[PDB]
Amino acid sequence: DTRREIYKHIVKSPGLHERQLAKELDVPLSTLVYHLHYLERRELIMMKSDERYARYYATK
Amino acid sequence: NADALELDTRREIYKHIVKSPGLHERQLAKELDVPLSTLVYHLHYLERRELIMMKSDERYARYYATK
Structure with missing residues (x-):
């Protein structure tokens, strides 16, 4: 049910985020x-x- | 060889990083x-x-189905 819906939303719509x-x-x-x-x-x-969404810092 | 434009853009980028750490590339x-x-x-x-x-x-990880 819920798990099969999650896996399927990922197949049809690749690349989504956790909150999306x-x-x-x-x-x-x-x-x-x-x-x-x-x-x-x-x-x-x-x-x-x-x-x-990667973040950049100067090295020491 | 590197133009004045390439060197200026590079140095302006590097030191905005130092003055403002942790930004994303679109910012x-x-x-x-x-x-x-x-x-x-x-x-x-x-x-x-x-x-x-x-x-x-x-x-912000992106989820994909394995093949």
Whole structure:
């Protein structure tokens, strides 16, 4: 039900964020994270860093 | 070889980093009035020279289905 909906929203709409997923499915963030962890542990979904949100610092 | 424009843009970027740490590249571009493509060109260079470092933010990770 909820898990099968989360995995499917990811197949049809690749690249979404954690909070964009919980909004487009009306699933609480805590519930969605538990299912995302299962889907990662089974290697059915993966995870990429968003360059648009990386932060830059000068080195020492 | 590097134009005055390339050197000026590079140094202006590096030291906006020092004066204002932790910004994203779209904020970097709008605050320096530089196109995003050119800014990312200079960020990769400053990172190759280890003058700046790039920290990912995993709160904004993108989710994809495996094949």
